Ligand binder design. Structure first.
Ligand SMILES: O=c1[nH]c(NC[C@H](O)[C@H](O)[C@H](O)CO)c([N+](=O)[O-])c(=O)[nH]1
Ligand SMILES: O=c1[nH]c(NC[C@H](O)[C@H](O)[C@H](O)CO)c([N+](=O)[O-])c(=O)[nH]1
Ligand SMILES: O=c1[nH]c(NC[C@H](O)[C@H](O)[C@H](O)CO)c([N+](=O)[O-])c(=O)[nH]1
Ligand SMILES: O=c1[nH]c(NC[C@H](O)[C@H](O)[C@H](O)CO)c([N+](=O)[O-])c(=O)[nH]1
Ligand SMILES: O=c1[nH]c(NC[C@H](O)[C@H](O)[C@H](O)CO)c([N+](=O)[O-])c(=O)[nH]1
Ligand SMILES: [Ca+2]
Ligand SMILES: [Ca+2]
Ligand SMILES: [Ca+2]
Ligand SMILES: [Ca+2]
Ligand SMILES: [Ca+2]
Ligand SMILES: [Ca+2]
Lengths: 147, 146, 147, 147, 147
């Protein structure tokens, strides 16, 4: 009946991860939507994890109506920051189009822990909740179009 | 009369209005018809056009072209580049992979001022520029019997 | 028989557009090649147009031997420059491979209009003729190889 | 049956290569997982090798449960850094999705030799192990989804 | 029957291209492998050329064991440097994966004509030879895997 989504969380920085999740679940809960939660090491494996979910469903496995990506990448002194940020979001967008699925992108790309918390906190900019909401929104348009 | 789909990313509500207004005028003056759909941010614009095509293949509404409306203003974070890059890159592939006409109206500005100068019909009117561009692309698709 | 090209020009800066177009027709003429010219608003729609041509060809429409993409992107005070430059040249390179076609890349991406005219003018760097000639060489290779 | 991983190392900086390889084999061994180590000249050939491996598996060859990519790019005076770092990482992420395979990403992308050692040492950041571990986690998730 | 490679060179800067090709041929003679040499105008038309080579082999043409890509891009004032460098290599990297072929990437991406010479010359950094040996090595890994 109600939409059932998969929340794929890249758990690199534990505390912030809990923040994004707190808001994510909140939004889904309010909307009366259910979900499952899978934890991955870094934002880089988020797109492959959703890929895994798709293949499973095509084997009689759980079928999800939408996904929500949660993660945080903080700018240090190494170029790695761009790469982890670019590849995760790049592969995530290609995925939403090529597989025609509803994806809410909640992967932060800030310069420091300061900025992260302002966006991570639910009582603040609650980006985790904004991502869950977007996913719900997309789940809606997907139906409205007959996709 | 061509019937397009305007997919607007409503992040900055006021600028969104500026662009939409801009785009709706270019099509009206063209006698073109359209439908408007709203997504939270520029990142879901491409998957939305993808949904449109899918719904069509299933007897759904058939669109002659699409107009993409959106705005990304650089903050203090690198998020600006990501949203900009990915929404535009994906949108480009799509036009090619599905052979569809798309008017790219996704602003990639540094500050709110640049955002207002391109989003205003009275100014650069990049909202209407994308509508016309899409109309033009629609015409080409036909002339090539694609 | 002589090759028949499709010149896909992005006409954003009319005056520079003519510079490139003049240098491209010049080269093509000088080598006995014939062509068709199509106009698009910005460099972003260049690939899609070659895509339309490719679909049309598969529907009895004209069959082209090669393509000559001509365009110009001048950096502003906005990141939009990077995007137009990036996506137009990324989609093209892609198209030449995915479809195995001959394409001359004549899309300028300069810092200012001063530099624009240097690469656009046939009396100068004549990038229109260089991109045009390129397509001819590729059309040739495409044959020597058997594809 | 413990997983069998394929360690694919780009050995450009011989010493750093050893540090990462050391950290990778450490994590896998603790996990009780077996593996094979194949060497390539640079991060650019890492993804194409994993490709070679999947092809062999489809031809009765060895079948790996997951992959571990190890490499290192230190920025110098050339833009080559950007390229080597970007392409190697991008193709490696597409592959994880297109092919739906577990891939730990241990390719270092740093500004200098200092940052390189901080990250390639098992005694320190231990990126080599973090990668192997990531590959292991993905292998479990893959099975959990029955993908 | 030794391995037959295809050297695809972008002859933009005639002298640097000579240096590069020289280092490449040498490394192949010494490894005792044969090869053909095809010439293109810019690094941008290298990936398409290899593509042409593959489709030809599917139409009964010469079947190559690997490919060596040679080219040099020097940073001017224009953003064109970024594009030529990025696209050539991106298209090259993906091609190798998508087609599972052995490719040696020898496209130099430098800041000035002096950096290029230290890399181009065989009596120096010998990138041209380095690239050839890569193609050989990959041709080797491609076999050991049964790809
Ligand atoms: O989600 C993140 N993952 C990170 N790890 C990179 C990658 O996501 C994987 O964990 C690992 O590289 C191998 O897959 C980060 N940094 O390294 O800085 C980061 O800031 N954020
Ligand atoms: O269109 C925009 N969307 C934005 N949101 C990001 C993305 O478009 C999605 O809304 C959401 O991230 C996941 O669905 C922006 N910022 O965050 O800054 C922005 O400037 N512009
Ligand atoms: O060819 C160009 N098109 C441009 N327009 C962008 C795009 O090519 C399309 O015309 C339109 O955006 C919607 O399709 C440019 N700028 O905006 O600066 C530019 O410099 N060059
Ligand atoms: O793995 C690396 N390979 C490198 N070589 C480039 C490429 O990986 C291949 O070795 C070769 O270019 C042809 O395939 C590097 N640099 O040049 O700096 C580097 O830092 N790291
Ligand atoms: O291989 C190169 N090609 C170049 N031309 C770009 C491209 O490779 C094609 O020659 C042409 O653009 C049309 O195909 C270069 N510059 O312009 O500077 C360069 O330095 N190196
Ligand atoms: Ca199912
Ligand atoms: Ca229909
Ligand atoms: Ca001002
Ligand atoms: Ca004009
Ligand atoms: Ca098997
Ligand atoms: Ca220090």
């Amino acid at each position: 009946d109600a939409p059932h989504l998969l929340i794929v969380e890249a758990r690199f920085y534990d505390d912030l991860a809990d923040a994004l999740l707190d808001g994510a679940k909140a939004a889904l809960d309010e909307a009366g939507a259910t979900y499952d939660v899978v934890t991955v090491p870094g934002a880089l494996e988020i797109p492959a994890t959703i890929s895994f979910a798709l293949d499973g469903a095509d084997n009689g496995g759980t079928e999800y109506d939408g996904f929500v990506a949660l993660g945080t990448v903080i700018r240090g002194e190494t170029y790695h920051f761009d790469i982890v940020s670019n590849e995760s979001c790049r592969a995530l967008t290609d995925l939403s189009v090529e597989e025609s699925i509803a994806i809410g992108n909640g992967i932060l790309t800030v310069e420091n822990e300061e900025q992260a918390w302002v966006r991570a906190r639910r009582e603040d900019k609650d980006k985790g909740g904004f991502a869950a909401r977007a996913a719900l929104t997309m789940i809606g348009l997907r139906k409205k179009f007959g996709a």
